[PDB]
Structure 1
Amino acid sequence: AAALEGPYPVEEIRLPRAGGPLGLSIVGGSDHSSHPFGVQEPGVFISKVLPRGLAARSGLRVGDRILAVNGQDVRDATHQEAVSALLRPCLELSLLVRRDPAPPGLRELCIQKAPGERLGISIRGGARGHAGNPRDPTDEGIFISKVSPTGAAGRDGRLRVGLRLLEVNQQSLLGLTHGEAVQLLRSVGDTLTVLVCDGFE
């Protein structure tokens, strides 16, 4: 395996197995779309590192591409092959990861809505929908298509046309349809916590 001299350096990170959770989340797998992680090169990615849990203290970062789990190559592993490998009983968890960067513009937004105030946005894309990304028709992600200047999002100022939506109130939008994404955004309540990154212009 080399898997060496790539765009980004690789490194074996050991996580101790003394009870408790890893404090990480993974997306991707050969049977999945992992946008915006590895758009040209698919795989398994660390999508979320809990601060400051086991994964965080060990040096794992959001965007990390997992190449091997305890010596087991997982570059072509399905999402469940990867998950099971990470859950298999072992004295110590060895992760060969490649230090791919997190998707550009990755940031969490907390948006406040006054009582009776609407969000004032519309979205495009979604799994098995119409291409929300003009630059890439294979991309089935969720993007902001419109922002009303007077709505909550408009007055907040941070949401804008083009941004990719990743999760809403801790609920992931990956693999979700347009309608499933819409019902999440509508039932969000007084406070919208949304994970976004740059998508298009």
Structure 2
Amino acid sequence: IVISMPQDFRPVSSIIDVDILPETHRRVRLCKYGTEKPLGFYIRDGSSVRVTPHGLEKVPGIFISRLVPGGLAQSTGLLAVNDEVLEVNGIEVSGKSLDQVTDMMIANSRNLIITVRPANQRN
């Protein structure tokens, strides 16, 4: 059985800024193979309960709703359903609508920096 040297080297994903971020957050980098394929995950609307300058309120939140099987996001293992999306390439999603956050991801899809608050799986 003949095995060649490696070819077409490509960095796909990583976790960055781990030391300067809250432990409950994860900043992920995704670099898709080519312009034409999808990042591989959908996002939905939702509400997040937070302690605001005025108290505990339920504010609009963005969450991952599913992963395409065999897709990019899924292959990395860095994104799961129920993870809340907080930021996309330096732009926070708080004052943003679902469609805007969707547009932002498509705009930055060739080099995506997405910061999420992972969901915890029951042990």
User: What TM-score, normalized by structure 1, do the two folds share?
Assistant: 0.42
Report the CA distance shift for 1:139/1:198 in structure 2 as closer, same or farther (over 3 A).
farther
Residues 98-155 of structure 1: CA deviation (Å, up to 9, x unaligned):
xxxx4x5212101120112211211111xxxxxx25x859231111011112221111
Query: Is the Cα–Cα contact under 8 Å of residues 40 and 68 in structure 2 kept in the other structure?
Result: yes
The answer to whether 1:171 aligns with 2:91 is: yes
Match of 1:110 among 29, 32, 57: 29
Q: Distance in 2 between matches of 1:198 and 1:140?
A: 17
Of all paired residues, the percent bearing the same amino acid is 26
Q: Distance in 1 between matches of 2:104 and 2:70?
A: 21
Q: Distance in 1 between matches of 2:111 and 2:71?
A: 14
Give the unaligned 5+ runs of structure 1.
1-50, 52-60, 63-101, 126-131
Query: Is the Cα–Cα contact under 8 Å of residues 123 and 145 in structure 1 kept in the other structure?
Result: yes
Query: Is the Cα–Cα contact under 8 Å of residues 164 and 196 in structure 1 kept in the other structure?
Result: yes
Q: Distance in 2 between matches of 1:200 and 1:144?
A: 13
Q: 2:89 is aligned with what amino acid?
A: N
**Count of residues paired in the alignment:** 95
Structure with bigger RCO (C-alpha 8 Å, 6+ apart): 2
Query: Is the Cα–Cα contact under 8 Å of residues 112 and 152 in structure 1 kept in the other structure?
Result: no
Q: How does 1:135-146 map to 2 (within 5 A)?
A: 138-146=58-66
Q: How does 1:1-201 map to 2 (within 5 A)?
A: 102=22, 105-115=24-34, 116-125=36-45, 132-133=46-47, 138-199=58-119
* Greater share of strand: 2
Secondary structure of 2:60's aligned partner: coil
Please tell me whether Structure 1 or Structure 2 has the larger radius of gyration of its CA atoms: 1
Query: Is the Cα–Cα contact under 8 Å of residues 119 and 153 in structure 1 kept in the other structure?
Result: yes
Report the CA distance shift for 1:199/1:175 in structure 2 as closer, same or farther (over 3 A).
farther
Secondary structure of 2:64's aligned partner: strand
User: What TM-score, normalized by structure 2, do the two folds share?
Assistant: 0.65
- Per the alignment, residue 74 of structure 1 pairs with none
The root-mean-square deviation of aligned C-alpha atoms, in Å, is: 2.5
- Per the alignment, residue 28 of structure 1 pairs with none
